[PDB]
UniProtKB/Swiss-Prot annotation:
The name this protein goes by in its record: Autotaxin
Gene name of this polypeptide: Enpp2
Residues the record marks as carrying a glycan: N345, A357, N471, N751
Positions of the UniProt region annotated as Required for secretion: 774-795
Keyword Ubl conjugation: no
Organism: Rattus norvegicus
PTM statement from Swiss-Prot or TrEMBL: N-glycosylation, but not furin-cleavage, plays a critical role on secretion and on lysoPLD activity.
Binding residue positions for Zn(2+) 2: D258, H262, H421
One GO CC term, this protein: extracellular space
SMB domain sequence ranges: 1-44, 45-89
Documented EC number(s): 3.1.4.39, 3.1.4.4
Annotated catalytic residues: T156 (nucleophile)
Amino acid sequence: TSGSCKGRCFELQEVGPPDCRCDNLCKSYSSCCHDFDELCLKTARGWECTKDRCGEVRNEENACHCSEDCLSRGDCCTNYQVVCKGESHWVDDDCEEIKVPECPAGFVRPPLIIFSVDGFRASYMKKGSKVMPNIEKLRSCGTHAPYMRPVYPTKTFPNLYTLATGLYPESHGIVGNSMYDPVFDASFHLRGREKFNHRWWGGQPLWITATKQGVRAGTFFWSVSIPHERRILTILQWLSLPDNERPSVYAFYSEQPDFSGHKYGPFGPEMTNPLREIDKTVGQLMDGLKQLRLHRCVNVIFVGDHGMEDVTCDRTEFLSNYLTNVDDITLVPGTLGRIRAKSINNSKYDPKTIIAALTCKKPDQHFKPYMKQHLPKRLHYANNRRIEDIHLLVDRRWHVARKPLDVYKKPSGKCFFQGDHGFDNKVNSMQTVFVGYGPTFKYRTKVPPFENIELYNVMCDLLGLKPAPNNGTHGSLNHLLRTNTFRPTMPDEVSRPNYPGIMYLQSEFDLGCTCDDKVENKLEELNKRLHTKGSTKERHLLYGRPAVLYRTSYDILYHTDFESGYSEIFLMPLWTSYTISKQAEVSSIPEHLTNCVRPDVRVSPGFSQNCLAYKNDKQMSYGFLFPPYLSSSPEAKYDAFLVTNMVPMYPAFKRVWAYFQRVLVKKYASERNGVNVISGPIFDYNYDGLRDTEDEIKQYVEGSSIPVPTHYYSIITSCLDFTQPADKCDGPLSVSSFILPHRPDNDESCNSSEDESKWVEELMKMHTARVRDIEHLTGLDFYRKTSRSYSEILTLKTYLHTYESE
Ligand SMILES: *[C@@H]1O[C@H](CO)[C@@H](O[C@@H]2O[C@H](CO)[C@@H](O[C@@H]3O[C@H](CO[C@H]4O[C@H](CO[C@H]5O[C@H](CO)[C@@H](O)[C@H](O)[C@@H]5O)[C@@H](O)[C@H](O[C@H]5O[C@H](CO)[C@@H](O)[C@H](O)[C@@H]5O[C@H]5O[C@H](CO)[C@@H](O)[C@H](O)[C@@H]5O)[C@@H]4O)[C@@H](O)[C@H](O[C@H]4O[C@H](CO)[C@@H](O)[C@H](O)[C@@H]4O[C@H]4O[C@H](CO)[C@@H](O)[C@H](O)[C@@H]4O)[C@@H]3O)[C@H](O)[C@H]2NC(C)=O)[C@H](O)[C@H]1NC(C)=O
Ligand SMILES: CC(=O)N1CCC(c2ccc3ncn(CC(=O)N(C)Cc4ccc(C#N)c(Cl)c4)c(=O)c3c2)CC1
Ligand SMILES: [Ca+2]
Ligand SMILES: [Cl-]
Ligand SMILES: [K+]
Ligand code: NA
Ligand SMILES: [Zn+2]
């Protein structure tokens, strides 16, 4: 209600009731003092000095000032010095390297300004280059990536809050632009008051991190009605505050180009103007900085939240074409789908029937249903009660809706949107931008594409802050920075391995296993012992053994063709490592060995699996981590049938695994000049993306203590310079990895009735993963011994092979 904004315009500390507000959010709350527009939103004479205004007598009613006292007051129009003092616009100056911060007296650290653009698709940097000269200058003189990968869903609020926290949406809680929380019994929407409640927003955003550590920073939010010119003058005025009152971190947000993109499509003729306007805004800021002598002092980040795809009303799939009982569901619609029961706590609603009704029903169906725990692990989109159990991943360019009436509104439905976003974060059109410019960033430097979850750590480094715990890998972006404040180091190994020798006689085992192995000297007898003691180990373990980062009991087991870390707790390897050269031969499993499983005399009966359990369990079969198909000799092949190389596999999954092992590994070795492979099980029954403890396991091989993995991983490494073979590589490494769901059916692959060569590799691609994802899921740390710097290895562990084109 009552009070005035006199002397309080855009105040940094927000005031509580009954008092009214004057901060950059009061409009959104409808709580500004009655004089806020008059005092704080002045517009008279616009935003630019003209020659007749130079030296004018100050008139306090003006939007900005061209009077002689304006620099000292901090409120000149941004082009004042250009029009009134002969100066050049920032964009017209040559790029000059900023070797050290050049800041006015009283500046304790380089401020950080974050310039966020909604819907700014990565390819705008090239395609709109002719109309964005300020942005193209930032980009070419500063540090830039060809693109930056958003988080899933590629929506506005999940991505902006990820930028601010370094957390996946499942952890920070802003899991969509709209969501329903079943505990609150309440819905969050872009428009409305509910989103104002702090209960939705978890983690610790940069502004709170800054404030707790004595670095001044307000929120990054802005009321929509404040025009962009007024946001810029406001940041410039804040920058003129006394040392003790002045923030060190600033955020500008633009609703464009996303606003126009939705109307016109990502490349509509109408899009050129919104890009011109954003560029002009960047020039205002840079001109303003140059006037305050801050242009070689501040670090500027030009970053988007997501891209934009062509999407029209007629490319909509309707759930009413698949379900008969469509009135029993609630759907969060659009470029993703989330389905829950219409009536809360209803007993006769069956997720399984709904999934079945939505699976592979039309040949060219433009969505695929998933239980959230089965979504690709790279999306990290499950561990939150606001994420509905049923999820539809929608094809790029499409929508999903519940019924035709939701889309085609009355009289009779015309469209009027041509662009949208929210799809899978690997989709090219969803990629967005990153540019860093300033003393702390590198000069004229390209960096590879990286994920937006990494930026929070870098922003904290830019500000001298210790980051709160987050999902970035701190050190993975050190290569963006001229001067690093963070020196990453490897985690300490927690469990050391046992190295067992031959300890058990064959007749001590009663595993119900058989093998035809008595088949067949003194020459290849010391050679056998040498191999078991680790002689080929430098060939098959190329980057050191993985470190185990939790308390457990495990054995290193050496063999001619592979090495493994065998867990006595889980009764199977945590990891199995082997190298396949370009020249390696694929062989079959000989007939007499089809069902061969051999006791491992290094490992006690009590810490072994047993064949009887597999015989008894009519759902569950087994496979091998090191593939028998890739044995170096008929004799070495016997090692691949050890009980200690066996893992539980559904027959449906064995189709996938066997194709990977028999066909794909050798293909990758041919294409990449050898590969090193590390494979193993993953257990994540509570879908939190983290290694399960043994008391979290919900499924065992019938009547045994053999736990069933939820997923199987492989990491496939070779030499970046493929003229060098994987095992003799002098330089940087190249990696691709996957985490395959261990599922009892192949319903996810609509083509699975066909030959494996038509569907397996597509499935694997969909489930591509970062090394770092596998680390969280296993409590292992890889690449412990290489000739590469740790920062570079941290970048490699964050890499995701996406299989998109260009
Ligand atoms: C990505 O990175 C993130 C961050 O590093 C990783 O997420 C972290 O994962 C940790 C391990 O799972 C988890 O540890 C929990 O923490 C429990 C305490 O939870 C609350 O407090 C957290 C800390 O708050 C303070 O610090 C932050 C700075 O970061 C400040 O900003 C805060 O203001 C505080 O000062 C807090 O972050 C956490 O937030 C969640 O819940 C909020 C409130 O509802 C949400 O608003 C918010 O969005 C968060 O929601 C996410 O996380 C929760 C789980 O925490 C999840 O359910 C949601 O779906 C969502 O994803 C809370 O407010 C602590 O109690 C836990 O300890 C119990 O379990 C362990 C074993 O698991 C035991 O060792 C322990 O003894 C204890 O068990 C006992 O007690 C239980 C009964 O109470 C019972 O189960 C049992 O029987 C025992 O008796 C454990 O430490 C972190 O909370 C979590 N942080 C975040 C932000 O998510 C994430 O894993 C990374 N992802 C990947 C893939 O790597
Ligand atoms: C958590 C907290 O402090 N709260 C809870 C939310 C609250 C609140 C109050 C008023 C608001 N007025 C406008 N908008 C729209 C807007 O600012 N954007 C579109 C730009 C933007 C900029 C940075 C981030 C980020 N990160 C994000 Cl998600 C969005 C808001 O979202 C908004 C939120 C403030 C206090
Ligand atoms: Ca888990
Ligand atoms: Cl959403
Ligand atoms: K079986
Ligand atoms: Na199928
Ligand atoms: Zn949008």
